[PDB]
Structures are given as C-alpha cells and as structure tokens.
Design a protein around this motif. Sequence first.
Motif, PDB file in Angstrom:
ATOM      1  N   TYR A  87      38.695  38.590  52.651  1.00 42.52           N
ATOM      2  CA  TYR A  87      37.679  38.533  51.597  1.00 42.52           C
ATOM      3  C   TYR A  87      38.113  37.777  50.345  1.00 42.52           C
ATOM      4  CZ  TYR A  87      33.800  41.487  53.301  1.00 42.52           C
ATOM      5  OH  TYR A  87      32.648  41.967  53.916  1.00 42.52           O
ATOM      6  N   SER A  88      39.414  37.589  50.148  1.00 41.66           N
ATOM      7  CA  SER A  88      39.876  36.800  48.988  1.00 41.66           C
ATOM      8  C   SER A  88      39.408  35.346  49.026  1.00 41.66           C
ATOM      9  CB  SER A  88      41.405  36.880  48.833  1.00 41.66           C
ATOM     10  OG  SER A  88      42.085  36.066  49.796  1.00 41.66           O
ATOM     11  N   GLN A  89      39.055  34.858  50.218  1.00 44.20           N
ATOM     12  CA  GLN A  89      38.486  33.524  50.345  1.00 44.20           C
ATOM     13  C   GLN A  89      37.102  33.379  49.745  1.00 44.20           C
ATOM     14  OE1 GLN A  89      40.392  31.029  51.429  1.00 44.20           O
ATOM     15  NE2 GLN A  89      41.998  32.590  51.693  1.00 44.20           N
ATOM     16  N   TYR A  90      36.480  34.520  49.414  1.00 46.96           N
ATOM     17  CA  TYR A  90      35.144  34.557  48.827  1.00 46.96           C
ATOM     18  C   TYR A  90      35.213  35.135  47.416  1.00 46.96           C
ATOM     19  CZ  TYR A  90      33.632  33.541  53.542  1.00 46.96           C
ATOM     20  OH  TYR A  90      33.430  32.952  54.781  1.00 46.96           O
ATOM     21  N   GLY A  91      36.418  35.159  46.852  1.00 46.61           N
ATOM     22  CA  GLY A  91      36.600  35.695  45.518  1.00 46.61           C
ATOM     23  C   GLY A  91      36.447  37.194  45.371  1.00 46.61           C
ATOM     24  N   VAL A  92      36.629  37.935  46.470  1.00 42.80           N
ATOM     25  CA  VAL A  92      36.458  39.395  46.483  1.00 42.80           C
ATOM     26  C   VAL A  92      37.807  40.041  46.827  1.00 42.80           C
ATOM     27  CG1 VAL A  92      35.235  41.350  47.487  1.00 42.80           C
ATOM     28  CG2 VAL A  92      34.081  39.198  47.230  1.00 42.80           C
ATOM     29  N   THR A  93      38.352  40.833  45.902  1.00 43.33           N
ATOM     30  CA  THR A  93      39.567  41.624  46.133  1.00 43.33           C
ATOM     31  C   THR A  93      39.439  43.004  45.510  1.00 43.33           C
ATOM     32  OG1 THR A  93      40.720  40.685  44.174  1.00 43.33           O
ATOM     33  CG2 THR A  93      41.129  39.593  46.255  1.00 43.33           C
ATOM     34  N   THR A  94      40.151  43.976  46.067  1.00 42.11           N
ATOM     35  CA  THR A  94      40.238  45.293  45.463  1.00 42.11           C
ATOM     36  C   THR A  94      41.700  45.704  45.275  1.00 42.11           C
ATOM     37  OG1 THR A  94      40.108  46.422  47.613  1.00 42.11           O
ATOM     38  CG2 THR A  94      38.043  45.978  46.511  1.00 42.11           C
ATOM     39  N   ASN A  95      41.889  46.622  44.341  1.00 42.40           N
ATOM     40  CA  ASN A  95      43.180  47.221  44.060  1.00 42.40           C
ATOM     41  C   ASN A  95      42.897  48.639  43.608  1.00 42.40           C
ATOM     42  OD1 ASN A  95      45.785  47.899  43.258  1.00 42.40           O
ATOM     43  ND2 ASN A  95      45.995  46.220  41.753  1.00 42.40           N
ATOM     44  N   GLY A  96      42.993  49.588  44.529  1.00 43.19           N
ATOM     45  CA  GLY A  96      42.760  50.998  44.214  1.00 43.19           C
ATOM     46  C   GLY A  96      41.325  51.248  43.833  1.00 43.19           C
ATOM     47  N   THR A  97      41.071  51.491  42.555  1.00 47.55           N
ATOM     48  CA  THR A  97      39.712  51.707  42.051  1.00 47.55           C
ATOM     49  C   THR A  97      39.084  50.481  41.397  1.00 47.55           C
ATOM     50  OG1 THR A  97      40.456  52.359  39.881  1.00 47.55           O
ATOM     51  CG2 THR A  97      40.404  54.085  41.493  1.00 47.55           C
ATOM     52  N   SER A  98      39.745  49.329  41.468  1.00 44.84           N
ATOM     53  CA  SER A  98      39.246  48.105  40.874  1.00 44.84           C
ATOM     54  C   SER A  98      38.703  47.137  41.936  1.00 44.84           C
ATOM     55  CB  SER A  98      40.341  47.387  40.075  1.00 44.84           C
ATOM     56  OG  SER A  98      40.682  48.062  38.867  1.00 44.84           O
ATOM     57  N   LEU A  99      37.569  46.526  41.594  1.00 42.88           N
ATOM     58  CA  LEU A  99      36.941  45.453  42.330  1.00 42.88           C
ATOM     59  C   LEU A  99      36.889  44.214  41.454  1.00 42.88           C
ATOM     60  CD1 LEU A  99      35.210  44.265  44.693  1.00 42.88           C
ATOM     61  CD2 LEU A  99      33.237  45.280  43.508  1.00 42.88           C
ATOM     62  N   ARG A 100      37.518  43.125  41.910  1.00 42.90           N
ATOM     63  CA  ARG A 100      37.546  41.865  41.178  1.00 42.90           C
ATOM     64  C   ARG A 100      36.642  40.880  41.927  1.00 42.90           C
ATOM     65  NH1 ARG A 100      42.425  37.412  41.050  1.00 42.90           N
ATOM     66  NH2 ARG A 100      41.748  36.244  39.189  1.00 42.90           N
ATOM     67  N   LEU A 101      35.687  40.309  41.199  1.00 45.40           N
ATOM     68  CA  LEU A 101      34.800  39.256  41.674  1.00 45.40           C
ATOM     69  C   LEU A 101      35.037  37.965  40.895  1.00 45.40           C
ATOM     70  CD1 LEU A 101      31.392  41.179  41.895  1.00 45.40           C
ATOM     71  CD2 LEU A 101      33.107  40.887  43.728  1.00 45.40           C
ATOM     72  N   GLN A 102      35.551  36.981  41.612  1.00 46.17           N
ATOM     73  CA  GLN A 102      35.810  35.647  41.093  1.00 46.17           C
ATOM     74  C   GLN A 102      34.652  34.726  41.419  1.00 46.17           C
ATOM     75  OE1 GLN A 102      39.581  36.036  43.387  1.00 46.17           O
ATOM     76  NE2 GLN A 102      40.228  34.368  42.008  1.00 46.17           N
ATOM     77  N   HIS A 103      34.055  34.113  40.398  1.00 43.63           N
ATOM     78  CA  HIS A 103      32.912  33.219  40.606  1.00 43.63           C
ATOM     79  C   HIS A 103      33.382  31.886  41.220  1.00 43.63           C
ATOM     80  CE1 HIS A 103      29.397  30.634  39.209  1.00 43.63           C
ATOM     81  NE2 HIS A 103      28.930  31.504  40.094  1.00 43.63           N
ATOM     82  N   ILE A 104      34.520  31.395  40.708  1.00 40.80           N
ATOM     83  CA  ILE A 104      35.107  30.093  41.080  1.00 40.80           C
ATOM     84  C   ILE A 104      36.568  30.350  41.393  1.00 40.80           C
ATOM     85  CG2 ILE A 104      35.500  27.675  40.362  1.00 40.80           C
ATOM     86  CD1 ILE A 104      33.314  27.859  38.392  1.00 40.80           C
ATOM     87  N   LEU A 105      37.025  29.764  42.502  1.00 38.96           N
ATOM     88  CA  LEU A 105      38.401  29.899  42.963  1.00 38.96           C
ATOM     89  C   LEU A 105      39.215  28.733  42.430  1.00 38.96           C
ATOM     90  CD1 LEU A 105      37.780  30.980  46.610  1.00 38.96           C
ATOM     91  CD2 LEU A 105      38.267  32.412  44.706  1.00 38.96           C
ATOM     92  N   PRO A 106      40.538  28.889  42.340  1.00 41.10           N
ATOM     93  CA  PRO A 106      41.389  27.786  41.855  1.00 41.10           C
ATOM     94  C   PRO A 106      41.165  26.443  42.542  1.00 41.10           C
ATOM     95  CG  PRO A 106      42.655  29.751  41.938  1.00 41.10           C
ATOM     96  CD  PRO A 106      41.332  30.103  42.619  1.00 41.10           C
ATOM     97  N   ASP A 107      40.851  26.461  43.835  1.00 44.31           N
ATOM     98  CA  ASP A 107      40.599  25.228  44.578  1.00 44.31           C
ATOM     99  C   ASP A 107      39.228  24.627  44.347  1.00 44.31           C
ATOM    100  OD1 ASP A 107      38.797  26.710  46.297  1.00 44.31           O
ATOM    101  OD2 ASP A 107      40.490  27.294  47.529  1.00 44.31           O
ATOM    102  N   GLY A 108      38.420  25.264  43.502  1.00 42.99           N
ATOM    103  CA  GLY A 108      37.121  24.710  43.117  1.00 42.99           C
ATOM    104  C   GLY A 108      35.911  25.197  43.899  1.00 42.99           C
ATOM    105  N   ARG A 109      36.136  25.994  44.941  1.00 41.97           N
ATOM    106  CA  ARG A 109      35.022  26.645  45.617  1.00 41.97           C
ATOM    107  C   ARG A 109      34.327  27.585  44.620  1.00 41.97           C
ATOM    108  NH1 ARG A 109      37.831  29.228  50.786  1.00 41.97           N
ATOM    109  NH2 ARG A 109      39.541  29.164  49.283  1.00 41.97           N
ATOM    110  N   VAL A 110      33.008  27.697  44.770  1.00 43.42           N
ATOM    111  CA  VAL A 110      32.165  28.570  43.924  1.00 43.42           C
ATOM    112  C   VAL A 110      31.512  29.633  44.823  1.00 43.42           C
ATOM    113  CG1 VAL A 110      30.366  28.610  42.141  1.00 43.42           C
ATOM    114  CG2 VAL A 110      31.760  26.576  42.421  1.00 43.42           C
TER     115      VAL A 110
END
Length: 398
Positions: free
Chosen positions: A81-104
């Motif tokens: 799921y990190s390829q779509y800007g979606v990661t979790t860590n315990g009780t946290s959900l991180r949503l990345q709009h744009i990835l370092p490689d420029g994918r949106v």
Amino acid sequence: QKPGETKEVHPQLTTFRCTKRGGCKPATNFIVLDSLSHPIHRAEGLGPGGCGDWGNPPPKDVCPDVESCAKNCIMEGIPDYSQYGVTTNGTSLRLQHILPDGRVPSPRVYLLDKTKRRYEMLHLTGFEFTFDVDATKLPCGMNSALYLSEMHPTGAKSKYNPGGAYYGTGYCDAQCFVTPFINGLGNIEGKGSCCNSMDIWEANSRASHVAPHTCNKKGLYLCEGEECAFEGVCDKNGCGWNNYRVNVTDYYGRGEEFKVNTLKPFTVVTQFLANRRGKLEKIHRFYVQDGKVIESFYTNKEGVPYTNMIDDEFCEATGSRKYMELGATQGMGEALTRGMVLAMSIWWDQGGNMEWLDHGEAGPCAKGEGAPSNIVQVEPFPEVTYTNLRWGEIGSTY
Ligand SMILES: OC[C@H]1O[C@@H](O[C@H]2[C@H](O)[C@@H](O)[C@@H](O)O[C@@H]2CO)[C@H](O)[C@@H](O)[C@@H]1O
Ligand SMILES: OC[C@H]1O[C@@H](O[C@H]2[C@H](O)[C@@H](O)[C@H](O)O[C@@H]2CO)[C@H](O)[C@@H](O)[C@@H]1O
Ligand SMILES: *[C@@H]1O[C@H](CO)[C@@H](O)[C@H](O)[C@H]1NC(C)=O
C-alpha cells in the motif's frame, strides 16, 4: 471486477471504542483502498488497458453487459500500500497525496472490521467521534477528508462481485458521480452512485469545514438523469460549517494567533446530539490542543442565527435548501443510525481550486492560490496523518 492473483495486503490500524466507565479501549481494524484505485486490467488474451475511467460507463468492447464485464475485467490485489501513499504505524494512518517519484496517488481508503470482509459500521447518532490530526503539510487548495458514506457493509458482495469490501467495492457519496463499476458491477447504463454522506472533516491548514449531506434514498442508490443533478436525490452542497463563513477569523489557522494552531497537531471532537426521542438534532465540533479544550466558536454574522452547533435553524438560514428538502438533520441522523462506512482521503481540485473550502467566504486563500500548479510550488508533497481514531459515549473520547 474479478479479483486477480496478486495478494491484497491491508494495512492494520488500531482504533478505540470509548465509554465513560472504561475509557478508550483498543480495537483492531484494517485499511482498504477504493476498488477502482486497485490495478484494473483485462482477462487473458484481451490485450492491454483497463475497464473505464472515472465519469464513464465501462467500455462496451469488454463490458456489453454486467455478466461479461465480470469475467473480462480483473482487479488486482495491492501487496504494498505504500505505493499508493498509504501507510500505518500503530494508531496512525498517513496519506501521501504525492510520492517522491512524482506519482499523485491521491488515496481514498475505508475502514474494514477485524475480519477484513465487512466495513466497520459506525452508528454515531447519540455518540461522538474523535481523532488527532497533523495538517501542517496541507496548503490552500488541498482537501484532507474524513467522512461517512452509507455504503453497503460487504461492499455489496455478490455473484458478479466476489471481491466485496475486502477489495474496497461499493463506494458512493452525495455527488452521485458516474463510475465504471458500482457495487462491484459494470455500470453499463452510466448511472450515478448516490448516498448520504456525513462530512466530519474536510480541511487543510488554512480552513476547517464540517458538513452533513442528505439524500432522500437509503444506502447506495443508482441515479439516472435528473436524479443525479442538483434538484435530484442528493444534497451536493451540504450544510456547511466553517468559522470563516460565519465571520470568525481568529479560530483556526497557521500560527499562535489562532485558537487552533495548525502548525502543530491537534484533536478534533465531533458530537452527534440527539433529542429525547432518539433523533439527531445538533452536530457539535470542538478541538483540543496542548492539553486544553478549545470550545467551538459561535456564529458572528448578521442574518445568521447565533449558535455554536449545526442544526436545522442554522442550515435553513444559511440557504442549505437541498439539505433541508432531502431530509434535514433528522434524515442525516437516520442514516447515521442505520450505519455508515468511514472513508479517509486526500485530494485536490484542478477545475475549481477547492475555493469553497478556504477562499472568499471560506478562508484566507487568494484567487489561484489553491490551483494544483501552485500547490506543488508551496508544498511539493502534501500529506495528512490521522491518529487515534476513537468513538463512543459523549464526553468519553477526550
Ligand atoms: O471530487 C472528487 C473527490 O471526492 C471526494 O469525496 C467527497 C464527496 O464527493 C463529497 O460528497 C463529500 O462527501 O466530501 C467527500 C470528501 O471530500 C473523495 O474523497 C476523493 O477521493 C475524490 O477525489
Ligand atoms: O464536489 C466538489 C465539492 O463540492 C462542495 O460544494 C460546493 C460546490 O462545489 C460549490 O460549487 C458550491 O457553490 O459551494 C458548495 C459548498 O457550499 C461540497 O461541499 C464538497 O463536499 C464537494 O467535495
Ligand atoms: C464580523 O465580525 C466583526 C468582528 O466581531 C464585527 O465587528 C462585524 O460587525 C461582523 N460582520 C457582520 C456582517 O456580522
């Protein structure tokens, strides 16, 4: 679409159920990306390409009817799921709009229950929902969203949609958009995907918006023609609640001069207050930051009823006509009581710069400032993190 061979590896997310007596107690949940955000391709031998773009029915070559579409269109599991800007860590959900490689990737996800095969159905009338957020990397024009839609609990798992909620099928909202699959079935007639939506949070670091959106249909309704339009079955605009729109300018923003300082993380509390007969009457939003409760502002605008909560009087007076016509606060509450699915997303608006969120009446952002072309010059990698999602008894989550 037919599930492919690639494995779906859902991020795990710990959330909480809260009572006054027991406090907040942890619960295991999982995260699933929208079905149509999974890789969609064709069956063996049929060549390259997908099975339709947003806004359209699926292509007739492979989807002349639902049964054919179900066998010719393949939806792959996402094993990372990190390829779509979606990661979790315990009780946290991180949503990345744009990835370092420029994918949106602009991810939209739903909360699954502990089995991964049914959405977690929240029933919020008479209860409260709270979360912590880091909004620092959300400039003008960005929308971080956390909201409820009246989706089917298994994503309408069926003979032609075996994937179901496990693959994020069944999305709908109050905009009645046309998607090439609806409820995991090819949308041959190009119907819209309508349902009640409660927008707990649509916000960035510059403005914070809350809005219930009613529809006069229960659950997912496939609209045709005028049913999908402004005078149709769903409230596109919503009954909006934003301090700026009610002439309060020092409440929420980047810096110490705002009551809620978006340069730092904060807590967001939303109470769904019911009348004595169990129907929703008021929606109340307040915040906590640096260990201090920050009470809601009251409206401060000529012609607007004096209130610190969303209710029918406020929605009527501020011109939220379809909200009122399609069910009012009782109607929104009836959907909440039946049960709703939690959706979280991050997105921008090429057509309109999200002006309704943070420009003009809605915030400090200038004309053009929220254009995607400018957003990336201000914050090249917008993102949001939601933490400690928790719901339960009034007074118990904070
Ligand atoms: O406009 C496309 C984006 O829609 C987002 O969902 C909206 C929904 O359409 C509205 O009716 C309301 O409920 O607010 C939602 C959250 O902003 C969706 O989350 C995005 O993925 C889309 O790009
Ligand atoms: O679908 C986009 C967005 O629409 C929001 O409603 C806006 C609307 O786009 C604008 O044309 C109108 O004048 O104002 C309303 C707000 O009052 C809606 O509230 C959002 O949920 C939705 O994402
Ligand atoms: C807006 O708020 C300011 C500050 O409280 C107040 O002086 C002004 O009269 C308000 N304007 C309207 C239209 O209510």
